[PDB]
């Protein structure tokens, strides 16, 4: 009798109305309705649904397992997905005795994944309707419990298409008790073997193309129907939603631009004749036509521009705040390279950066966050997106003076922050993964993991807090004055050109460049146990592909996210990295060191570590939000970045 | 840590998306300024943390306005309009008070 | 009452930090021989006020059910026995402040 | 700026031509001389008609200059010396062909 049902929309306003009519009692109901700006161009569902009786709620952290375990702990005997928005992997739900059931609103198997409404109005389609099947590995791929079907009627009506819901709503209920209790769901036999993957798309390619065909035409002629969202459509001085329109059939080249009459507006165009009746321009009215050409002075016979002109492929200007470090010389190399960029930089040297000095558009200008105020702010005023990819982590300013930690890594920053908030500019907050500080977790979790640190009196931890204190007030920022960030945390980047002197952080932890430097006549000190644990790495050719997606924002997808960018499959101990050096190690620098120190030590030492438990073990990222934000996933394997990295170490410094 | 040592318990807070944990980690980071502050430039300094500092001068503010610093001032308000006495999360819990002329003496010769 | 019908979302109050809305409310006689809040009877739910008698029908906590008290507060979370609690500070309120600024003038003083 | 003798200290010279009017660009006449120019590329006759000055610009109460907008240079012609020269042909035909210039071809 108990039920927990996911609903949304008026079919799940009915849907919890049919449930409630049958006898079945929703015990709870714990939905992601969001639903922003509620009477934008409709009725108010919100408020319908309250009058109704259906308490709808928006968690904010729904997406905690902690309430997947909870919603589980209620026994779940069947589940129900009506456009549902969770990427939770199907492991853990694995428990369900029943199963799931999820209502799409394609044509299955054609043009599988999300937004089925915009699949099937685009691609020219005139079949829609409604598709109950069960949720396996084989997602949208399994076999069609019920597939209804509609009747085609030119003169529909609001009252007759509501007395039609209602009907098939009965006509569902009566096979629904009934199917799952004998078992007759007996299917008609469907090819399965054409399905073609498309992907999912965003609403940006829905802008209208002159040069496509009348499919168009054809879509916008069924979407002037009840009522749909309606055609978007941009003049270039006033954007606009038709709400209904009518096509001649006739080609109507004549005499391009010449109107023959304002009444109604009927103006020719490369493709048809365009009859512009009632449109709304945003959350405004539907006026006529001639109150719009007098009120903007529009010119008779101006043929309308999809987009209007600007530069090549536009030109959202990069502000990096430190460029001859480790990411900054790394990511101006993807930026200058795919156009659409017109990177900028402030760092106390061009050492890394002597390759684009000379570039048409690099704008290089030497100095310091702290003297050069006037720059910054000009610079956050003028350029697009923001990255402050400045910081100071030595051990050396962790102890001797933790007040340089704090007024050039907390003051410096706060201040830029506010110079994004006061211009209204993107910004790309370079996080850092030692906020987790003695996190017992096994994944760093961005939005899970507890962030543990020592007492006060230990200056070592000033900068795990300082750092961890901006990306709430980042976090505070964007919830109230509307900022729009994005807050990745490099876990272990390694590559070429990571402070070819004394490479102790910024880039990563101690770990690396160690053995290397050993390897100099130096007598590498492999403890097997003590010290060994695991050591995770990212190439930099990974790390930078992501921060170059995450600057792209393909769907605003990275707005107001925590993303962690590691290689938590790429384990590798201590003793694993020696090995591999050393294998890699006979290329072609033997002459020296010739006797192979502390080569074969296989002898399990009795030393311990040393006074104070201050080293890390478990610092595995969680990549998650990467891939589900992203798409993106570590490619290059340990030995490619091992390789590389030795391959510019002793090159250029390599004497003999 | 059972016992919430001053210079052995570690602190622990929520992820950054929880926004009720930037005044634990505001009053901790100006705890490890004035530490900083009093090493490099000698600052003569003294960090009290009063727990449960309760007494009769707390607070009114029209029945704790919505329950703001609650602690015992509801108690005290059911205790007048024959309220019955309200369990939280079924009242296990314990607490322990510290008298204000305790907490004041203490903060005297500090 | 009756002036917060359709098509207005209804009559608006606050208790603690959450806002709930009536639709409508019944009268009950006058008669009356217990103390506001004490229950004696669940089938129907019937309480008590100081002066008076009116029962609600319908009323919805910020955005739920438009029901009982009984049913918003399993739905909701929350526990029976609490009165309704309105806007304190009725009638005198508080004396509005007026800064004046240059008060020993003609028009200030006057 | 070069202020000969300090006498343009503590002024409130107008500079404009107050006898260059010019109604509607004379329906275009200089254009009629200067549409030929040279290339022959977007070069089409175009067409007539009149529906409403409603439409082309406003006449209302609040945003109306009454009047005119013609100055009195008086402090031009004495602080320095200056009387208007150009007439409006040039500036028309010298317009038309800068700003044909700065778009090149497309």
């Not at 129900?80 to 199963?99: K, T, V, W």
């Not at 036999?189 to 193309?209: I, K, M, V």
């Not at 005023?381 to 402050?388: E, F, G, Q």
Request: glycine share 8%.
């Amino acid at each position: 009798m108990k039920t927990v049902v996911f609903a949304y929309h008026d079919m799940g306003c009915l849907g919890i109305e049919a449930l409630l009519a049958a006898g079945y009692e929703i015990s709870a109901i714990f939905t992601h309705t969001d639903n922003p700006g509620e009477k934008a161009f409709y009725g108010s569902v919100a408020r319908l649904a309250a009058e109704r009786g259906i308490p709808v709620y928006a968690p904010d952290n729904v997406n905690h397992p902690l309430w997947v375990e909870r919603i589980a702990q209620l026994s779940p005997d069947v589940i129900f997905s009506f456009y549902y928005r969770h990427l939770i992997y199907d492991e853990i739900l694995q428990l369900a005795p029943a199963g799931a059931f999820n209502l799409h609103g394609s044509l299955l198997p054609k043009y599988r994944g999300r937004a089925p409404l915009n699949w099937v109005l685009v691609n020219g389609e005139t079949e829609t309707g409604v598709t109950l099947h069960r949720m396996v590995k084989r997602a949208d791929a399994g076999a069609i419990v019920a597939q209804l079907r509609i009747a085609i009627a030119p003169d529909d009506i609001a009252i007759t298409l509501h007395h039609k819901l209602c009907h098939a709503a009965r006509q569902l209920l009566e096979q629904t008790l009934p199917a799952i209790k004998h078992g007759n769901i007996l299917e008609i036999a469907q090819r399965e073997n054409e399905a073609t993957c498309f992907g999912r798309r965003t609403p940006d390619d829905s802008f209208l193309e002159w040069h496509k065909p009348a499919s168009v035409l054809h879509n916008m002629v069924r979407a002037v129907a009840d009522p749909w969202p309606g055609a978007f459509s941009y003049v270039g001085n006033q954007k606009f939603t038709v709400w209904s329109s009518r096509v001649h059939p006739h080609a109507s080249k004549a005499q391009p631009g010449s109107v023959i009459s304002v009444a109604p507006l009927l103006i020719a165009c490369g493709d048809g004749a365009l009859e512009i009746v009632t449109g709304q321009a945003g959350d405004g009215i539907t006026m006529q036509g001639s109150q719009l050409a007098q009120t903007l002075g529009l010119v008779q016979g101006s043929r309308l521009n999809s987009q209007p002109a600007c530069t090549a492929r536009r030109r959202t200007r990069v502000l990096i705040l430190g460029v001859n470090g480790f990411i900054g010389n790394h990511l101006t190399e993807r930026l200058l390279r795919e156009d659409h960029y017109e990177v900028y930089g402030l760092d106390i040297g061009s050492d890394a950066i002597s390759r684009f000095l000379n570039h048409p558009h690099f704008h290089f200008v030497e100095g310091d966050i702290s003297i050069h105020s006037e720059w910054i702010e000009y610079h956050v005023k003028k350029c697009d997106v923001v990255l402050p990819l400045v910081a100071i982590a030595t051990p050396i300013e962790y102890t001797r003076n933790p007040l340089r930690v704090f007024e050039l890594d907390f003051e410096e920053n706060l201040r830029i922050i506010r110079y994004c908030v006061k211009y209204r500019k993107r910004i790309i907050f370079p996080s850092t993964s030692e906020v987790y500080g003695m996190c017992s977790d096994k994944y760093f979790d961005e939005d899970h993991s507890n962030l543990i640190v020592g007492p006060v009196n230990k200056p070592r931890w000033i900068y795990s807090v300082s750092k961890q204190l901006l990306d709430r007030v980042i976090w505070a920022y964007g919830e109230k004055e509307g900022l729009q960030f994005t807050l990745f945390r490099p876990f272990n980047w390694m590559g070429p050109r990571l402070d070819n002197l004394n490479a102790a952080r910024i880039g990563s932890s101690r770990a690396i460049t160690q053995l290397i430097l050993n390897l100099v006549e130096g007598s590498p000190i492999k403890l097997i146990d003590g010290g060994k644990q695991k050591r995770c790495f990212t190439d930099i050719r990974d790390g930078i592909e992501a921060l170059y997606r995450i600057i792209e924002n393909a769907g605003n997808r990275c707005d107001g996210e925590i993303i962690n960018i590691g290689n938590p499959e790429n384990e590798a101990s201590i003793e694993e990295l020696g090995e591999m050096l050393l294998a890699s190690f006979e290329k072609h620098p033997l002459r020296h060191h010739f006797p192979p120190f502390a080569g074969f030590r296989v002898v399990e030492s009795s030393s311990y570590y040393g006074k104070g438990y201050q080293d890390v073990e478990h610092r595995k990222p969680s990549i998650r939000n990467a891939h589900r934000c992203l798409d993106w996933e570590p490619k290059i394997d340990m030995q490619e970045t091992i390789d590389e990295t030795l391959d510019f170490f002793l090159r250029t410094v390599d004497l003999t």
